[PDB]
Design a protein around this ligand. Structure first.
Ligand SMILES: [Zn+2]
Length: 161
Protein backbone atom coordinates (compact mmCIF):
# COMPACT_ATOMS: atom_id res chain seq x y z
CA UNK A 1 0.00 0.00 0.00
CA UNK A 2 1.77 2.89 -1.50
CA UNK A 3 1.54 5.27 1.38
CA UNK A 4 3.96 7.67 2.87
CA UNK A 5 2.48 8.28 6.21
CA UNK A 6 3.78 11.34 7.87
CA UNK A 7 4.20 13.23 4.53
CA UNK A 8 1.58 15.57 3.24
CA UNK A 9 -0.61 13.17 1.33
CA UNK A 10 -3.64 13.88 -0.78
CA UNK A 11 -6.24 11.48 -2.09
CA UNK A 12 -7.77 12.02 -5.49
CA UNK A 13 -11.57 12.30 -5.38
CA UNK A 14 -11.97 10.74 -8.78
CA UNK A 15 -9.64 7.73 -8.95
CA UNK A 16 -9.50 7.43 -5.10
CA UNK A 17 -5.73 6.78 -5.06
CA UNK A 18 -3.15 8.44 -2.81
CA UNK A 19 -0.38 10.87 -3.65
CA UNK A 20 2.04 12.99 -1.78
CA UNK A 21 1.63 16.67 -2.65
CA UNK A 22 5.36 17.33 -3.23
CA UNK A 23 5.12 14.95 -6.21
CA UNK A 24 3.44 17.82 -7.96
CA UNK A 25 5.30 20.89 -6.70
CA UNK A 26 2.25 21.85 -4.62
CA UNK A 27 3.19 24.32 -1.87
CA UNK A 28 2.89 22.33 1.39
CA UNK A 29 4.21 25.12 3.64
CA UNK A 30 0.58 25.69 4.81
CA UNK A 31 -0.29 21.96 4.67
CA UNK A 32 -0.47 19.16 7.29
CA UNK A 33 -0.38 15.35 7.10
CA UNK A 34 -3.84 13.79 7.62
CA UNK A 35 -6.00 16.67 6.42
CA UNK A 36 -9.57 15.97 5.25
CA UNK A 37 -10.67 19.55 4.46
CA UNK A 38 -9.84 19.65 0.75
CA UNK A 39 -10.78 18.18 -2.60
CA UNK A 40 -8.05 17.04 -4.94
CA UNK A 41 -7.79 15.59 -8.44
CA UNK A 42 -4.48 14.13 -9.72
CA UNK A 43 -3.29 15.33 -13.14
CA UNK A 44 -4.24 12.08 -14.78
CA UNK A 45 -7.95 12.30 -13.68
CA UNK A 46 -8.63 16.08 -13.96
CA UNK A 47 -9.83 17.52 -17.34
CA UNK A 48 -7.00 20.04 -17.81
CA UNK A 49 -4.09 17.64 -17.24
CA UNK A 50 -3.13 19.75 -14.28
CA UNK A 51 -3.61 19.08 -10.64
CA UNK A 52 -6.71 20.51 -8.80
CA UNK A 53 -6.51 21.39 -5.13
CA UNK A 54 -9.41 23.12 -3.34
CA UNK A 55 -8.70 23.88 0.29
CA UNK A 56 -11.68 24.22 2.59
CA UNK A 57 -11.87 26.02 5.96
CA UNK A 58 -11.58 23.24 8.63
CA UNK A 59 -14.71 22.61 10.77
CA UNK A 60 -14.34 21.60 14.46
CA UNK A 61 -14.27 17.95 13.60
CA UNK A 62 -11.53 18.22 10.94
CA UNK A 63 -9.45 20.26 13.40
CA UNK A 64 -9.71 17.55 16.07
CA UNK A 65 -9.16 14.71 13.58
CA UNK A 66 -5.98 16.35 12.26
CA UNK A 67 -4.64 17.21 15.64
CA UNK A 68 -5.27 13.69 16.89
CA UNK A 69 -3.88 12.01 13.77
CA UNK A 70 -0.74 14.12 13.97
CA UNK A 71 -0.16 13.82 17.69
CA UNK A 72 -0.61 10.10 17.41
CA UNK A 73 1.68 9.67 14.42
CA UNK A 74 4.44 11.78 16.06
CA UNK A 75 4.12 9.85 19.31
CA UNK A 76 4.22 6.53 17.48
CA UNK A 77 7.39 7.44 15.57
CA UNK A 78 9.32 9.58 18.12
CA UNK A 79 8.57 8.56 21.76
CA UNK A 80 10.12 5.64 23.58
CA UNK A 81 6.57 4.96 24.89
CA UNK A 82 3.75 5.78 22.39
CA UNK A 83 0.58 7.51 23.67
CA UNK A 84 -2.75 7.05 21.87
CA UNK A 85 -4.74 9.34 24.21
CA UNK A 86 -4.05 12.99 24.35
CA UNK A 87 -5.01 15.74 26.79
CA UNK A 88 -7.55 18.28 25.58
CA UNK A 89 -5.79 21.16 27.38
CA UNK A 90 -2.16 20.14 27.17
CA UNK A 91 -2.06 18.55 23.73
CA UNK A 92 -5.08 19.03 21.48
CA UNK A 93 -5.68 22.71 21.99
CA UNK A 94 -2.00 23.79 21.69
CA UNK A 95 -1.84 21.81 18.43
CA UNK A 96 -4.88 23.44 16.92
CA UNK A 97 -3.53 26.77 18.16
CA UNK A 98 -0.07 26.22 16.73
CA UNK A 99 -1.05 24.90 13.31
CA UNK A 100 -4.21 27.04 12.97
CA UNK A 101 -2.99 28.56 9.69
CA UNK A 102 -2.51 25.07 8.23
CA UNK A 103 -6.24 24.36 8.64
CA UNK A 104 -7.96 27.65 8.09
CA UNK A 105 -7.40 31.24 6.93
CA UNK A 106 -9.86 32.52 9.57
CA UNK A 107 -8.43 35.49 11.55
CA UNK A 108 -7.79 35.01 15.28
CA UNK A 109 -11.53 35.33 22.71
CA UNK A 110 -11.80 32.38 20.38
CA UNK A 111 -14.84 30.28 21.16
CA UNK A 112 -13.70 27.01 19.51
CA UNK A 113 -11.82 25.74 22.65
CA UNK A 114 -15.18 25.55 24.50
CA UNK A 115 -16.70 23.43 21.74
CA UNK A 116 -14.14 20.80 20.80
CA UNK A 117 -15.26 18.44 23.59
CA UNK A 118 -18.93 18.36 22.46
CA UNK A 119 -17.63 17.82 18.94
CA UNK A 120 -15.60 14.72 19.79
CA UNK A 121 -18.15 13.44 22.30
CA UNK A 122 -20.84 13.14 19.72
CA UNK A 123 -18.69 11.39 17.11
CA UNK A 124 -18.11 8.19 19.07
CA UNK A 125 -17.46 6.12 16.02
CA UNK A 126 -14.56 8.40 15.31
CA UNK A 127 -13.27 9.54 18.65
CA UNK A 128 -12.33 7.74 21.89
CA UNK A 129 -13.20 9.66 25.04
CA UNK A 130 -12.04 9.32 28.62
CA UNK A 131 -13.48 11.86 30.99
CA UNK A 132 -11.41 10.50 33.93
CA UNK A 133 -8.32 8.31 34.62
CA UNK A 134 -8.98 4.49 34.73
CA UNK A 135 -9.53 3.03 38.31
CA UNK A 136 -6.10 1.99 39.59
CA UNK A 137 -4.26 4.38 37.21
CA UNK A 138 -1.37 6.65 38.39
CA UNK A 139 -2.44 9.25 35.59
CA UNK A 140 -3.02 12.73 37.15
CA UNK A 141 -6.49 14.32 37.01
CA UNK A 142 -5.12 17.64 35.64
CA UNK A 143 -4.36 15.92 32.29
CA UNK A 144 -8.02 14.97 31.72
CA UNK A 145 -10.16 14.84 29.89
CA UNK A 146 -8.50 12.86 27.08
CA UNK A 147 -9.22 11.92 23.50
CA UNK A 148 -7.96 9.51 20.84
CA UNK A 149 -9.01 8.05 17.47
CA UNK A 150 -11.14 4.96 17.40
CA UNK A 151 -9.38 3.86 14.22
CA UNK A 152 -5.63 3.63 14.72
CA UNK A 153 -5.22 2.93 10.97
CA UNK A 154 -4.09 6.43 9.99
CA UNK A 155 -4.18 5.48 6.31
CA UNK A 156 -8.03 5.41 6.54
CA UNK A 157 -8.18 9.10 7.22
CA UNK A 158 -9.29 11.07 4.17
CA UNK A 159 -11.78 13.49 2.60
CA UNK A 160 -15.50 12.58 2.64
CA UNK A 161 -16.03 11.72 -1.03
ZN1 LIG B 1 -6.97 10.63 -9.78
Amino acid sequence: NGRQLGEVELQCGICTKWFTADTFGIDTSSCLPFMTNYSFHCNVCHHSGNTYFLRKQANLKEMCLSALANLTWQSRTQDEHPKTMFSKDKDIIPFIDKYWECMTTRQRKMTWPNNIVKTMSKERDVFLVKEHPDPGSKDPEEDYPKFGLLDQDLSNIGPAY
